[PDB]
Symmetry: D2
Subunit: 399 residues, 4 copies
């Protein structure tokens, strides 16, 4: 281990902090997954998970995998090799999903934007209006691009598909959005939505949570992609049998998810969404007070789960990250690929409160001084805390 | 929860009991997987994992998946669709691997044996001697068939491949054997060996541990199967970069594996193998004293990780399992598919000692009476404990 | 630290096995004991603790101490130096309490019996009959002598006090009885009852739980023993203030006690008492099958929380304890003081089930063979199992 | 129980934050305290505890008690009723110790100062000069008064005792100093030093750690105070027997203390003292920037483990504590007794780092605005950060 004094400040956008009640719930020996207790628990998880996607008709699947594995399940259950997909390259994780799509032998129409911009829906509109024969089988879009702090407008994608009477499936990566930003599966007509357990759900890595619409389930009948581990049909077979698991799940993660959902419902999903909004706004006010720039190029794309901070050209963003780890016991997110060295990222998602964030922001001011950037000490902390003092609600449990 | 008094007796062959030191090691918040601590830890895990496979030249991969996902990785990295495989159907898990092989569009030559028998190597010999053009690309064989308690002789498979000068790859499922039975990857010339974390390693579910020979790595160059999540090449890319992880791992499971390996090395792999042998022998002596039958039909196939007990035709093995759970707080393994109702299974693998086993065996005697089978109370416990009293070693830490 | 394979079998009569939900509850950071949460939790603990003493009139105190500290609190709050007490020396822990009584300058009338016998009540009657001037201020009696497996009849003590119309206080050590044997504080007119957390409550050491009748509280007014840390009046002061704690408690033990009481009420106290009666009878049956002798000399004094086993002259009881630790990963109780080397102890209390005990008993058979006693293997297990197969109830949570 | 989002900010001066490796170490079932493992562990604890007291001659005792119980042990082992003691009343905890001294029938010479001042050493000198017949048997002095943030100079007390050639014993409460401020038991000639586990050691409540000089041990021979639970002689008896425990310890706290001492030695005691000096100075700088006043009246008495902050007349200090709990998920210390409503306390001790403190300080700024104090947001954070950016050392484990 590389011990440092006090509690480590985890401000990467995934993995995130795990609440103590959830750590306690996972503190347990293994159990027999074919015992009656594990199906009974699973049944309550499947029902409650629908609530965080805001679906009544969707079917969830709890894969023992990561977000990348959930991606793969969404594609191989609904599509066949050679099928045409439209996807939006706006940063590193949208890029990696497109890399996966190409490697699974789909025909990807790539719509590129500069990093810090959102998906180009004008190009989408143009592609849909020209696609009279309905060759585009799916739209694959990242809701929140974790590399750049850009949130896309999923409802506008649905507006366009309906406008053109176009039957393409809508597959949405909500890995860094679900349970932090608003997500409305049924209202937006999302056919496959996915998230990972180590993001806003505030768990260890290891669940890739997939939720499919009736339309996506219908599509599996014609899907000629190959799948076994990620095949929805095996799960559906075991759902009907009442045992739920075609192979072994993580007992610990199932009890942990139970506790995580209980905390989410106790705080209240809409209160969680408002909490992320306050923390994102607070962070963006601090970045402006420092004189630095948000990577996000227009206010319509702001992300309340991550802020990608751009640094002047003589400052190395990856040196900020290194100094945070070595001196301040603080984990910040690296700039990736195209924005390597030009940004660092402040994650603000999952189970984190305002004083935690303010401690991070104060550390960043010291790091900036350490690398020779002339910040006025306290100016960002003061901008965040002046805003937060107006809006922090009282904790209802304490009256 | 379905609470019962005292400690639950977990005697299914996976998941198994987790030692307390490993539970403690996993009792932790998330950490940044791109921090320097996680690569440094990973490097020591990859080195030590080679020791439990007994390989010096093999390359390990720590997938966040289950044993079924490790299966899929072994096939899709080394083979192409349409390739001819020989595999051995001797029970439920060998059957499920063949189901997977067929579903990934390989041409499977299935060699069937009755449940309770081992792989038919005479048929193998015949297929190899006829295969002058080397159309068989791989042999896929389960080392220990968890459904029936049958262990196959992997060295004999290698003897035959070399005898016929035959270049087929050797893929071995050691899910219920590695770190309990002897496994000699390099001496046996295994090209892909795999295990799961929830078996003898004594962890939660969630790691599918794959170890590949240089020959298997060479084969990825010609593999035209599709893979992304399970693609070895992405791991190898990140191994060379020194960060190791192409996507997020489970932080908790990495520290837990560190603690599990430390305990394995402290007890000593050969002492662990001898401990499983004592417990299996003890169990088989008890079954004979009860007047029941081992499913395993010949002594050459006995399994020191699981004993499948056959019950007379008027006794329902699944009623034994149910009664264990409802009255004795004891988890026993169900008969599966073909042996449903005709067997129940006593798992004896992972971190379990002799008094734990004897408590299970005494419970089974009471259950047998409960269902009207005329056991002589104490006869199986006495047969096991008479044998064990000769062979239990002193605990070295206590002198 | 001195690792052995598998789970350690803890069969000493204190500390006992901690249920896993209680381990989870205690898995937490410190909290501010002056914050509103700790008084609110404490109030519920005080109410529910009364139910395990079976009192409605009594006042409980949760001292951060051990059983010996609860002893000391019991004495110094109700008595003055020079006060005459009657106490019963029947074993090591009744002896230690008398040693403490003498060192606190009380005038102790010691009624002695051989180890393996109960309190001599005909001597008590004679003392009460002769004490016309009520110089006897208290009877101090151990309910269950953990060193010998002897349980005294507290109801019979009250009968004698009432028969002679004698006002003495009745102080009762129930450290190894309460929440395992029946205990009726009000029905028996017990004035001070005490237990410790690491016994049948199944917690860590660290709470000395004292419960006082209104008569005992009146006695504090005239008690001139010196006390501060153990003074009930400081607790009562803070009870009235609403904050409950005159100095810092263990946060972890308070939450642990909440969880332990919840498990007790879920199983049901009467069911817990029944479960201890099964375990005790099964152990005594095994001892009889082995041809060994119970230390306890009459049936009326049998203890359902501990069995002290007498060994023949060529056997050293300490060697049995040593062998259990070194070979079998089993903890058994030593013979103490007068019975050192002549006995060993099997503890059967707190959260333990029948298959755990049977594993212990099977292990003891092997140890007896090791040290040269001609036991018939299986004979004690068979006697215990025959009995238990008729009496173990179904687990109500599992239907 | 009263859940709030994110991690709770624990800034009371006891209980303090527990490091995660210590939480993990304590996450364990009970064990037999008479088994060979617990004496072997205890011996290492006794040796290493001496290093935190900076003694080679002293004998430590690990009582299962709180700080108040360590007080009581200190007094009753070295003094007799009627013995004259000199003690210094400067705050709530020095007052409680005097209250205990009087209730144990000692003749207490009370030297009083205003809250916010240190011990009046010129009065002590005058007392020592006048005590020709050495009737003063001991000086009892709190090293750090946790109620006011005042640290006394123990070296100056020893200087006066030696100047007047006076033999009195020197008993020192270091409950909120040891392992945070410097403490030199032998160099200062301290005869009894005591601390509690839930302070800078960063454990749960439940150990009262007492360390006695050879002179204090000689004093037990003539001490006629009554004691059993707290009697050092019973410990010394069991030290010589090799088993160390006269009654049952907390297993979890022993392993927890092992892990806590390991963390202390890894960071380095001198580095821990430096870290507390940084935290204290940063807090006092923030207080000065806010325009508030330190309760401590002279620089020589400043405390690096707690800062008591005085608020203006229109502000109720208790309202600040309440608001911190209800809105900000922050625990701060109440003003006690004489300074109730006039002060609040910021605890800065044990395992806490600079970004944790800065989060607290930023939160206090918001609370001051809430309750109507015209703070300049960022002003205290900026003062603390400017100072800390020059002094935080690099974490040696991370290079
Ligand atoms: C939006 C998004 N999708 C997918 C991924 C990949 O998820 P994982 O690392 O769990 O495979 C990430 C990275 O965490 C992400 O941020
Ligand atoms: C030999 C064998 N291989 C593979 C599997 C499948 O493993 P998992 O359930 O982790 O997917 C099992 C079942 O546990 C097994 O026993
Ligand atoms: C009946 C009885 N009373 C008192 C004690 C002393 O308890 P402790 O070891 O908690 O101080 C014991 C020992 O556990 C005991 O068995
Ligand atoms: C200096 C000092 N001494 C003694 C005590 C009493 O300690 P406890 O609450 O552990 O009994 C305290 C309070 O924590 C204290 O601060």
């Amino acid at each position: 281990y590389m011990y440092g004094p006090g509690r480590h400040h985890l401000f990467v956008p995934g993995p995130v902090n795990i609440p103590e009640p959830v750590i306690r719930a996972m503190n347990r020996n293994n159990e027999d997954y074919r015992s009656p207790a594990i199906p009974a628990l699973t049944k309550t998880l499947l029902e409650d998970v629908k609530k965080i996607f805001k679906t009544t008709s969707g079917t969830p699947f709890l894969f023992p995998t990561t977000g990348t594995g959930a991606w793969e399940s969404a594609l191989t259950n609904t599509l066949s090799p050679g099928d045409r997909i439209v996807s939006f390259l706006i940063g590193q994780f949208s890029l990696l999903w497109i890399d996966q799509q190409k490697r699974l032998n789909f025909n990807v129409d790539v719509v590129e934007s500069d990093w810090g911009q959102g998906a180009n829906l004008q190009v989408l509109a143009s592609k849909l209006s020209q696609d009279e024969n309905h060759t585009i089988k799916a739209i694959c879009i990242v809701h929140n691009e974790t590399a750049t702090g850009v949130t896309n407008d999923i409802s506008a994608v649905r507006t366009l598909l309906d406008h053109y009477k176009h039957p393409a499936l809508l597959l949405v990566d909500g890995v860094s959005s679900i349970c932090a930003l608003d997500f409305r599966m049924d209202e937006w007509g999302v056919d496959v939505a996915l998230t990972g357990s180590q993001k806003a759900l505030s768990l260890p890595t290891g669940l890739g949570i997939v939720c499919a619409s009736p339309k996506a389930l219908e599509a599996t009948k014609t899907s000629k992609s190959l799948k076994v581990f990620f095949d929805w049909n095996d799960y559906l077979k075991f759902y009907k049998l009442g045992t739920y698991w075609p192979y072994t799940p993580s007992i610990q993660l199932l009890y942990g998810l139970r506790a995580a959902l209980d905390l989410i419902f106790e705080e209240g999903l809409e209160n969680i969404i408002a909490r992320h909004a306050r923390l994102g706004k607070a962070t963006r006010l601090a970045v402006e007070a420092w004189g630095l720039k948000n990577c996000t190029q227009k206010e319509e794309w702001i992300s309340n789960t991550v802020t990608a901070v751009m640094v002047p050209p003589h400052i190395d963003g990856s040196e900020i990250v290194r100094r945070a780890w070595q001196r301040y016991n603080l984990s910040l997110g690296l700039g990736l690929n195209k924005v390597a060295g030009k940004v660092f990222r402040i994650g603000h998602l999952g189970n984190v409160n305002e004083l935690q964030l303010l401690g991070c922001l104060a550390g960043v001011e010291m790091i900036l001084k350490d690398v020779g950037y002339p910040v006025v000490m306290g100016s960002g902390v003061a901008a965040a805390s002046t805003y937060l003092q107006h809006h922090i609600p009282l904790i209802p449990s304490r009256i």
